[PDB]
Ligand binder design. Structure first.
Ligand code: HEM
Ligand SMILES: CC(C)c1ccc2c(c1)CC[C@H]1[C@](C)(C(=O)N[C@@H](Cc3c[nH]c4ccccc34)C(=O)O)CCC[C@]21C
Length: 455
């Protein structure tokens, strides 16, 4: 039976647009989904989209014969500096399939054996930082996790050291990247963007793009000028040929790929580690089980690749953090042809869908009544999970190319943190989720008491 779609409250001629005039739009859309259910229409002047929250409908949205990746307005604003890199390109652009074919082997689970030593380099810098704190001191969790994830992708990506553990103020490239990302996100709720009042924003945005291009173009030119073969993605991109076209990536597209990886490794991955540690300190029995696994498995001064693979419970902790607060919380699709969603909702070719991942991950028909509880054991038997119920890394050929990298890095770092320190929630931290490009537990702080185990 063809059904009328619910719609949240309207503001006359502005329709639903003012609902996203908020500093926590994902959390606002989750509350709307709680009220309206598995699908709702969102209208603004000149656009309509449909927000999906149920596994029943998202399993159909994930059918690549019926739906392809759409560039949200968010991605279109980020494309002004990420260009036709993998994340901000349409599936039909030549540079998407070329870069996908060239880079897939560099991002495989087996490729992680080659990045492992570099990931350990940065993970040891984090452990040494925390070992060197004085008794009276605390840890700023998202800040240190971001130092770690940014430095890991810089070193594994391009053999470039941001040296984030040597700094209070970000590296100048990172101040320009963060300010460009903040401008991109700010433009989503900026009425009259061509008001001369925004001339200062536009000048600054162009300066920040120039800072990013200048450093990345220099690193690519320097690498071509040296002939050096390294264990990094830049070597793979300079040498690689697409088997289909037989072509390599050009230097401009390589720059966009590097900027794309640095955005990804600065945002989503540090939020995963921040939320994982938040949930562990709030659930001491889970923390104890994870710490027991780390002590049993990590028997050497630094972890081996194989030891990280044997941190099964730590991997379940990470999946359970991704379930509750996935740090890339939505993605957009368009209908390839006219189609009916869920036997109830007719769509025309081109019609857009948004997948609200945190709400999908709270579908009680999948996870049961205890959906708000942090219970990593939910992931003990993943064959029991119905199709498309768990989507923190997106869908199909447009799924996260970085998934294996992100999870290897996070499992290694969290394993070492649990081996080396006991943790205290010394402030009884009240979760406050700040929304930018990503989600983070803003102001999350802990104390770490060394177990005095040498590296
Ligand atoms: C916990 C960490 C991460 C999460 C939750 C995450 C999540 C996602 C999601 C949901 C998408 C699909 C976006 C869409 O459909 O519009 C995506 C795409 C992508 N991610 Fe990640 N990501 C993570 C880490 C990384 C890392 C570390 C890298 C690279 C080093 C990376 C690179 C990418 C790229 C290049 C794409 C585009 C892939 C394509 O369309 O060909 N991500 N990610
Ligand atoms: C770049 C990646 C990492 C990213 C980051 C944040 C968001 C996305 C993706 C995609 C989804 C997006 C939200 C939830 C979203 O639905 N937006 C939609 C709808 C929309 C909101 N205001 C607009 C102004 C003009 C045109 C469209 C829009 C959209 O962006 O089209 C808005 C906040 C940022 C967020 C989480």
């Amino acid at each position: 039976t063809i059904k009328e779609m619910p719609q949240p409250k309207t503001f006359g001629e502005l329709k639903n647009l003012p609902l996203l005039n908020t500093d926590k739009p994902v959390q606002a859309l989750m509350k709307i989904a709680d009220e309206l259910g598995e699908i709702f229409k969102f209208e603004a002047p000149g656009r309509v989209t449909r927000y999906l929250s149920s596994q029943r409908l998202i399993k159909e949205a994930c059918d690549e014969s019926r739906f392809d990746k759409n560039l949200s307005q968010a991605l279109k604003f980020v494309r002004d500096f990420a260009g036709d890199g993998l994340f901000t390109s349409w599936t039909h652009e030549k540079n998407w399939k070329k870069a996908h074919n060239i880079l897939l082997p560099s991002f495989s689970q087996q490729a992680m054996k080659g990045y492992h030593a570099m990931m350990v380099d940065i993970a040891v810098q984090l452990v040494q930082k925390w070992e060197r704190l004085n008794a009276d001191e605390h840890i700023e969790v998202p800040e240190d996790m971001t130092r770690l994830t940014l430095d890991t992708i810089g070193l594994c990506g391009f053999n470039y050291r941001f040296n984030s553990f040597y700094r209070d103020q970000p590296h100048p490239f990172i101040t320009s990247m963060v300010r460009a990302l903040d401008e991109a996100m700010n433009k989503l709720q900026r009425a009259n963007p061509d008001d001369p009042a925004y001339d200062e924003n536009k000048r600054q945005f162009q300066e920040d793009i120039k800072v990013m291009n200048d450093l990345v173009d220099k690193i690519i030119a320097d690498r071509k000028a040296s002939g050096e073969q390294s264990d990094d993605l830049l070597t793979h991109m300079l040498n690689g040929k697409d088997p289909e076209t037989g072509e390599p990536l050009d230097d401009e597209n390589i720059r966009y790929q590097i900027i794309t990886f640095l955005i990804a490794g600065h945002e989503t991955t540090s939020g995963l580690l921040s939320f994982a540690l938040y949930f562990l300190v709030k659930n001491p029995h889970v923390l104890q089980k994870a710490a027991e696994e780390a002590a049993r498995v990590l028997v050497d001064p630094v972890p081996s690749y194989k030891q990280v693979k044997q941190l099964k419970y730590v991997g379940m902790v990470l999946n359970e953090a991704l379930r509750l607060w996935p740090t890339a919380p939505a993605f957009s699709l368009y209908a390839k042809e006219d189609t009916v969603l869920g036997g109830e909702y007719p769509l025309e070719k081109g019609d857009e869908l948004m997948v609200l991942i945190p709400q999908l991950h709270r579908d009680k028909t999948i996870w049961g009544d205890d959906v708000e509880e942090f219970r990593p054991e939910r992931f003990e038997n993943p064959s029991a999970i119905p199709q498309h119920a768990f989507k923190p890394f997106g869908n199909g050929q447009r799924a996260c190319i970085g998934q294996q990298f992100a999870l290897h890095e996070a499992t290694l770092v969290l394993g070492m943190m649990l081996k080396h320190f006991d943790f205290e929630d010394h402030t009884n931290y009240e979760l406050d989720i700040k929304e930018t490009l990503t989600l983070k537990p803003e102001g999350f702080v802990v104390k770490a008491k060394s177990k005095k185990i040498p590296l």
